[PDB]
Amino acid sequence: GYEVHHQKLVFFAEDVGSNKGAIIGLMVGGVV
Amino acid sequence: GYEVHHQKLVFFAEDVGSNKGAIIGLMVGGVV
Amino acid sequence: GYEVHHQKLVFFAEDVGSNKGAIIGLMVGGVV
Amino acid sequence: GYEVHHQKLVFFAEDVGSNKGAIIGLMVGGVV
Amino acid sequence: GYEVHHQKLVFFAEDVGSNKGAIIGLMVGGVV
Amino acid sequence: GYEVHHQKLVFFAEDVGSNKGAIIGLMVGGVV
Amino acid sequence: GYEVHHQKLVFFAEDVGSNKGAIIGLMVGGVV
Amino acid sequence: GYEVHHQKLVFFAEDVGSNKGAIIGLMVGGVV
Amino acid sequence: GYEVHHQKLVFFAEDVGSNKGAIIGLMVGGVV
Amino acid sequence: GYEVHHQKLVFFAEDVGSNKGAIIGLMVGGVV
Amino acid sequence: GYEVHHQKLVFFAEDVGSNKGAIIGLMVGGVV
Amino acid sequence: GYEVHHQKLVFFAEDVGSNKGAIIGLMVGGVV
Numbered sequence: 088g089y090e091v092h093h094q095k096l097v098f099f100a101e102d103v104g105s106n107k108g109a110i111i112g113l114m115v116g117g118v119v
Numbered sequence: 120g121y122e123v124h125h126q127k128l129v130f131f132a133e134d135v136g137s138n139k140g141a142i143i144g145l146m147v148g149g150v151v
Numbered sequence: 152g153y154e155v156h157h158q159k160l161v162f163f164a165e166d167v168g169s170n171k172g173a174i175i176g177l178m179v180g181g182v183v
Numbered sequence: 184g185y186e187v188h189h190q191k192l193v194f195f196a197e198d199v200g201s202n203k204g205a206i207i208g209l210m211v212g213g214v215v
Numbered sequence: 216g217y218e219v220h221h222q223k224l225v226f227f228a229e230d231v232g233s234n235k236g237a238i239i240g241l242m243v244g245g246v247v
Numbered sequence: 248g249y250e251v252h253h254q255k256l257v258f259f260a261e262d263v264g265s266n267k268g269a270i271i272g273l274m275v276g277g278v279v
Numbered sequence: 280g281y282e283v284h285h286q287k288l289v290f291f292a293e294d295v296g297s298n299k300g301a302i303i304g305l306m307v308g309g310v311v
Numbered sequence: 312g313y314e315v316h317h318q319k320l321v322f323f324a325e326d327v328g329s330n331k332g333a334i335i336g337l338m339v340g341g342v343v
Numbered sequence: 344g345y346e347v348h349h350q351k352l353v354f355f356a357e358d359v360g361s362n363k364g365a366i367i368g369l370m371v372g373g374v375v
Numbered sequence: 376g377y378e379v380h381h382q383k384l385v386f387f388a389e390d391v392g393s394n395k396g397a398i399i400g401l402m403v404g405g406v407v
Numbered sequence: 408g409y410e411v412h413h414q415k416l417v418f419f420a421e422d423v424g425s426n427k428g429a430i431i432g433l434m435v436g437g438v439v
Numbered sequence: 440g441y442e443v444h445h446q447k448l449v450f451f452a453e454d455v456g457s458n459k460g461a462i463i464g465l466m467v468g469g470v471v
Binding site for chain 7: 271274
């Protein structure tokens with residue numbers, strides 16, 4: 088059978104989140 | 120069974136001269 | 152030209168530069 | 184021979200809602 | 216008993232006024 | 248004997264009768 | 280400046296029709 | 312001198328019927 | 344002549360049926 | 376002795392059936 | 408007579424912390 | 440002397456013990 092399933096997640100541009108001070112948090116349960 | 124197509128989710132914000140203090144919280148709780 | 156259930160979400164923001172610390176609270180659980 | 188489809192969602196804002204200090208609470212769980 | 220169902224939803228907002236503090240509260244969890 | 252076809256929807260909104268401070272509160276769960 | 284008193288507000292929601300996809304997408308910003 | 316107060320809000324959703332999958336997306340950005 | 348500010352926001356939800364996956368996507372910025 | 380600045384936000388959800396399906400993505404911005 | 412600033416935010420869900428399954432993401436974008 | 444400022448943020452859930460894991464992510468770039 089034929090099946091397609093994919094996605095894309097991009098979070099807006101803004102005042103870059105450098106280190107010390109600003110911050111970016113990514114949480115992904117466990118790993119493959 | 121059922122067939123589906125991929126999707127896309129994109130947010131974009133323009134800021135004059137990146138810098139100090141931005142904060143992003145992304146949680147992807149899921150399994151392949 | 153075969154098409155199935157598809158979607159797309161776009162959030163675009165263009166404007167000078169509000170104050171210190173923008174903030175993204177986003178959740179992408181997921182399920183089989 | 185007939186296929187189904189869904190809609191497209193676009194939230195576009197100029198002026199109101201600039202970078203730095205803005206707050207987006209967006210929930211994108213998943214699909215049943 | 217299947218038919219094509221698609222559309223486009225675009226929301227454009229823009230208007231000089233005062234102060235900042237803007238807030239987006241959107242729930243977009245899958246579809247029925 | 249109702250048929251479904253494509254369509255387009257665009258909405259443009261200016262100044263919110265009252266100070267600034269905007270607030271987008273929408274629930275986009277499935278469709279009727 | 281005017282004196283403001285408190286009050287009590289309660290809401291109860293049930294679903295008839297059939298089955299129930301519950302969905303609460305709300306924005307509770309604030310008012311001057 | 313002077314004194315101020317706010318109101319109280321209570322929300323309750325529950326009703327015998329079927330399925331589940333609940334989704335709550337909320338924005339509560341404090342306002343001065 | 345002292346500043347006074349209190350509040351009370353309550354969101355309660357429950358429903359049998361089947362499966363689970365509940366989803367909370369919430370943004371609670373802050374205050375100045 | 377005297378009232379001051381306070382708040383109160385309560386979220387309560389009950390879900391059985393399958394293994395715990397829950398996905399919480401919450402952003403608590405904050406202020407300097 | 409010193410000003411006091413406090414808040415109370417609480418999320419109650421009927422589900423402990425099982426194995427690969429429940430998922431919680433919390434981000435506090437701010438500086439002491 | 441120095442004004443008082445602190446808060447209370449709690450994420451809690453109750454049900455069946457179960458085993459080792461569940462998945463929680465806390466992001467807070469800051470230093471005393």
